[PDB]
Amino acid sequence: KLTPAQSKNPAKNELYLVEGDSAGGSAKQGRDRKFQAILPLRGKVINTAKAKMADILKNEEINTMIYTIGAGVGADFSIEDANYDKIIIMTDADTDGAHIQTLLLTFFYRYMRPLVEAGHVYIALPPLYKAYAWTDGELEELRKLQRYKGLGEMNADQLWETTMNPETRTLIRVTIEDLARAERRVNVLMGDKVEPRRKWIEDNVKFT
Amino acid sequence: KLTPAQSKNPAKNELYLVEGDSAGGSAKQGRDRKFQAILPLRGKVINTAKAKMADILKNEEINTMIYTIGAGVGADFSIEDANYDKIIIMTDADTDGAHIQTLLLTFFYRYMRPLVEAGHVYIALPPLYKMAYAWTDGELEELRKQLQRYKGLGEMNADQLWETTMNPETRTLIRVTIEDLARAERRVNVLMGDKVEPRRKWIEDNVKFT
Amino acid sequence: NIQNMSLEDIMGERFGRYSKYIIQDRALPDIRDGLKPVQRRILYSMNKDSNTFDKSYRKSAKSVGNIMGNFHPHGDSSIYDAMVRMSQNWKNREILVEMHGNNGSMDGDPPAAMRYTEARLSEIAGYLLQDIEKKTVPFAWNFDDTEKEPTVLPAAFPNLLVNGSTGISAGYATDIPPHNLAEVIDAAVYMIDHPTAKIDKLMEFLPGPDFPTGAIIQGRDEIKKAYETGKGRVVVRSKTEIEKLKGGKEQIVITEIPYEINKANLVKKIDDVRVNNKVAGIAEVRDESDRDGLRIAIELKKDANTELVLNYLFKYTDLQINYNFNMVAIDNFTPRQVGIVPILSSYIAHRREVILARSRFDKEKAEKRLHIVEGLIRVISILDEVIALIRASENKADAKENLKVSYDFTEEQAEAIVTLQLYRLTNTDVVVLQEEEAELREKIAMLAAIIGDERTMYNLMKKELREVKKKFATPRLSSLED
Amino acid sequence: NIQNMSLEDIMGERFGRYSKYIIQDRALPDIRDGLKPVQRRILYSMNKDSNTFDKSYRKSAKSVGNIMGNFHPHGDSSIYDAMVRMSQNWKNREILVEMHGNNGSMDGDPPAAMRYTEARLSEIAGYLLQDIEKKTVPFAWNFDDTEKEPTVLPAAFPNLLVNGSTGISAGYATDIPPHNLAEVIDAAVYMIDHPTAKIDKLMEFLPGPDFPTGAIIQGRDEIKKAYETGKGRVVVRSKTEIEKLKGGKEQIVITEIPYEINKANLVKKIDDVRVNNKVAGIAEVRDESDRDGLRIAIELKKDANTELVLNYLFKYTDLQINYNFNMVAIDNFTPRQVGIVPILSSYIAHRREVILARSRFDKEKAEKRLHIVEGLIRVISILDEVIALIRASENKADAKENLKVSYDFTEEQAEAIVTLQLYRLTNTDVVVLQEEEAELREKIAMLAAIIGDERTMYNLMKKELREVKKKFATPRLSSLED
DNA sequence: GACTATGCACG
DNA sequence: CGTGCAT
DNA sequence: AGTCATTCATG
DNA sequence: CATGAAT
Ligand SMILES: N[C@@H]1CCN2c3c(F)cc4c(=O)c(C(=O)O)cn(C5CC5)c4c3C=CC[C@H]12
Ligand SMILES: N[C@@H]1CCN2c3c(F)cc4c(=O)c(C(=O)O)cn(C5CC5)c4c3C=CC[C@H]12
Ligand SMILES: [Mg+2]
Ligand SMILES: [Mg+2]
Ligand SMILES: [Mg+2]
Ligand SMILES: [Mg+2]
Ligand SMILES: [Mg+2]
Ligand SMILES: [Mg+2]
């Protein structure tokens, strides 16, 4: 399922979780094969806060992560026997991209906390415009435009320099700050109960 | 794979071999459930004159016509045990439709001669035009007196299909008869067989590129 | 090179970003035109492209590809799937897309793939788009900032109720059943007249949903409940008949089944009852639906309690099901649960905006011309000296300046005058122009009045709605019981 | 209700239909533009839709669907696959389509689905279309019978040789390797001067194929056989180098591989040699290729016969292969096995027809305009009389009869004058009209000369081909040996 | 949104 | 076997 | 060219 | 368990 790094090296080696085969393929091309592996996520990732742990485990995307990271799941989980120094979630800069980042994160919190609390889980920041700009703010400042509809229409030369190059890339580090404020947050947004989510949405989402 | 007829009757029942799922779907919809079955042929059919009987018996479509018409294949072929007295080939009127027919026929010829020779193997002629319906440019212009060019089967709508091609009353239908065993063995090998040179020749002799 | 963010914060911006979008911009219909953004884009694009009921069908893929490149940046499959649905007459009370080719069945088999089918807008769909070209609805930029697309359609009929919507978002879902076009309009007309109409009275006109698949809807009490609050649970039961067969045996014959129900899967499940003998008495189950009738014979055995069986199938299959109103739409960019009242308020408010906007547009056109037409009538009175001034002018710019200065023409007249073709100098007839002046004056008065009198405006609304009804009205399919 | 047909008289008709069609209009290139019909449709279509190198990329699905609806009545997937290939710079020497996104790789992996990618014509493909708006090429009706499409393109360079073709039909197949643009033009240009050039002289200009993938080509003698008869067997061998390593170990590095060969598979089959110890001394195989360079490191063991290992990889893998020229193409509606000479002549033949057609078109345009410009010069000296006369006329038609009768203007001149906009009476200056008249006369003279003198027409054809060479010429990639 | 198998000719 | 337009 | 799984709310 | 726009 996955395209692996050339050398096994739990100290440099990075796992790129890419949203879609489209981008999955542009990453295989754009990458540095020595220490960079690619694992496509084909479809919307299961929700590990809502699903029965029966199904949760009979799930292809979920199996090949437990098994591609090689540390096992839950508390049977040994961070010391890991396979990657970094784990990078690279999605489209769209909303469904956001949604996928969201489902992955809850899985890594629910079932591999060591990793999130160890600061090994990151999130890529692809550019939104083309010099390159990430914010509608740093754009008109660059007016001194090729709006990226998704990782798709980026070309390996660009993807490398902009977002995969360890020397040129911006890269968000996921960090549990308040264990209890984090469990509440996750369980409201992603849990079985609809009503509190709706409430949250009303309280926090500004429709204008 | 196959959409069966609602009632067994190796005396009325018909098998429609349809090019592709789309038209196979329209056929499911347009048919008469009681006596018309549909067996979609999805893709170009294996060449039974070129390929090795190994690969041939391993070909999904082939196996699911033999085990559908229920009479086995070759000289182990029992006509009296057929399931349909009418096997109808329904393709687009395009060239690749003309191709599929070419390939299906060389199958029945080579592996169910008893069937073709008993006048049981048919070819459905769908309409090319609608302005009523016309089947040949000639039959056409006569209707232009006192034109939806059907690009293929998947563009006709189930009630139209039934009226023009599937309804045993309102339909034109070619019957495939053998007239010269030897002269129809020669024509099949030139066209569908391993050796390329004779085929190249036959084209140069018979096809007018103008 | 690397920035930390809290799990609590990262999950915040992400879910808020997506929640808002999938709510405002995907799963739930606007309350006025009743469309989800994908459907609007389909109709607006096909319409832009002239792919309309009165012209040949286009290949579905041409349409789909155009939608995808100009307006809706997503799956060519989703777009197609959406387009196919708006053409299935067993899912839409009044279909907005006409499709040539296998586009499905109630048996729920796949439609032909995009490469095979052909589509065009239906005539009624045109009515959803009516007057779009007269600046009657707010436009925004497409994902590209390269072309403007409409945010709501003019909706010359109340599509949201006529066709329904459904309906899965985040924090919110929607189920709105379809209704009879004639009934819905009758209510809207009654409410135009009586803004304060109570649900009880409105239901004299709009007694309940009307599925395109007919059948029986039971539950007047809950229909009311639903029209009041947007939620309610109703029963939908299949049209049945009993046929006496040769000597002792009876046959249950089904002719209409519940909306959103797959004929094939039903027939299977009813036969699974026979095969399992969960209830005693079934001899055979036969789907006998041909190309122009729905018919499922359930042949019973001799001495079989035919009420017992029919009751059992009603309970334990989809021969009968409960439909749940959960009418949520987008009003003011916000999700909102709504009943029959705010729905027609919104519609009517909307048609008001459209009719106002439309009349402003036409009036501005009649005026711009009436203005030119006045100037031309003047020119004739002084042709020789106006030609003389142009002869004497240095260029187009200058000529216009002199026309203004020497004869008080306005920029707009000076431009008309100066860009007349020479052969116009042949004419001397002021009368035709004066006739046009008159026709234009009358037209502006009529338009100005609509704009300036709530009543004049509302009678227009009513007039137009009634025309829509006279034209598209069709009988009920679904019967009502309690 | 029925009508019988012979099994012979029917496979005959059916197969002849498929035969002819798949030969003329699917699998084999036209000898002049070097395109298969689908390829020509993609090009002609994108061009009509203004989707060119100078303008934005356009979502791929939009181009495909338009092609499918207007010209090519076949699968969206076939059309896209074709379009993708035209954009891969490891299959075409000179790519005709530029594409944003994953369009594949030499590892044979799949390109991104049509919904993800953007595309537009490359600058050079524009030269394939140059002058199409100018009635320079025979058109025909599309399947719809609703729009005309070109049967061949103008081809401002020889695409059959430059990009190649391949190539599977009924009774015939085609394999034509790519060639260096400049070399091909150099050849063509020579043959223009020397109609009877023989293969040997042509080979001083066109020495052999130039693959986008590079590498070494061995077989001068066979290249000649091929350039003479259309068939030939030649050897292509990968470009290698030997790097020395620490620890006394040496290492083979591959940097160019043979055309039409899958890097990923090649790497496996080489590693397979190591695994099976088929030759002694391979340590490890590594594809070290990255976004900007192909590199396969084959690291050997210490004290290992490096020439032994390299010879084995050449013989027993695809590190070295045989390319088989089988140049067939479609000349006067017929499949024809052809060599360098019928090709280049057919091209020159075609470029002649185009250039002549072009010049007739432009001459007619210029004549018409000159004619109007001549009348306008006259009108200036009688400006006032002409105005007076038009004023005196009753309507536009009468104004023209007056202009003719009284001043001997022609219909076309009179219409021109009479439909001049008033402001034009301010640009009353003969000298710029007299300058246009002069440019026009010159232009007509130059074109008449082209039209009525083969030497002058070929000299144009040579000027132009050389401009294209100067503009798009690039260095050989593949080196030669015998 | 990738995958599965055929035709056709040619080493 | 693998190519590339087709089903 | 059909097929496979997942999100999201609801009964 | 199925619904319909989305990966
Ligand atoms: N019986 C065959 C098994 C594999 N298969 C394909 C296929 F692999 C690819 C394709 C395609 O790539 C393809 C395309 O449009 O590109 C179309 N088909 C369908 C034949 C119509 C394909 C089919 C046909 C359906 C079943 C058959
Ligand atoms: N992990 C899943 C196995 C089945 N599946 C589908 C799918 F069933 C349908 C679809 C679609 O119907 C579909 C569409 O565009 O309509 C797209 N996909 C792809 C996710 C992009 C689908 C995928 C995704 C690939 C693998 C996943
Ligand atoms: Mg996306
Ligand atoms: Mg076809
Ligand atoms: Mg889908
Ligand atoms: Mg029930
Ligand atoms: Mg394919
Ligand atoms: Mg070799």
Numbering used by the authors:
A (entry chain C): 415 to 544, 556 to 569, 577 to 640
B (entry chain D): 415 to 545, 556 to 570, 577 to 640
C (entry chain A), D (entry chain B): 3 to 484
Give the published text.
Quinolones trap the covalent enzyme–DNA cleavage complex, preventing DNA resealing and triggering cell death. The upper part of the topoisomerase complex consists of the E-subunit TOPRIM domain formed of four parallel β-sheets and surrounding α-helices. The WHD within the C-subunit together with the TOWER forms the U-groove-shaped protein region into which the G-gate DNA binds inducing a banana-shaped bend.
However, they differ in having a heptacyclic ring system formed between the quinolone 8-position and the 2-position of the 3-aminopyrrolidin-1-yl substituent at position 7; this seven-membered ring contains a double bond in ACHN-245 and a cyclic ether in ACHN-454. Moreover, we report the structures of the topoisomerase IV–DNA cleavage complexes with ACHN-245 and ACHN-454 at 3.43 and 3.24 Å resolution, respectively. Within the S. pneumoniae topoisomerase IV complex, a 7,8-bridged quinolone is hemi-intercalated into each DNA strand and stacked against the DNA bases at the cleavage site (positions −1 and +1 of the 4 bp staggered cut in the 18mer DNA) as found now in many other Gram-negative and Gram-positive topoisomerase IV and gyrase complexes. The carboxyl at quinolone position 3, besides interacting with this magnesium ion, also makes interactions with ParC S79 and R117; the lengths of these interactions are similar for both drugs. The amino group on the 7-(3-aminopyrrolidin-1-yl) group makes key interactions with a cluster of two glutamates and an arginine (ParE E474, E475 and R456 in ParE) through a single oxygen of the carboxyl groups of the glutamates and the main chain carbonyl of R456. The stacking interactions are very similar, but the cycloheptyl group of these Achaogen compounds projects towards R456 and D435 and if modified could form a scaffold for substituents which could span towards these and other residues and impart further contacts.
